[PDB]
Motif scaffolding. Sequence first.
Motif: not given
Length: 13
Positions: A10-11, A3-5
């Motif tokens: 979106y994965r 979620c932050s990468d």
Amino acid sequence: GCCSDPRCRYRCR
């Protein structure tokens, strides 16, 4: 965390 990468924009699941 996907979620932050930038490669997991979106994965987060």
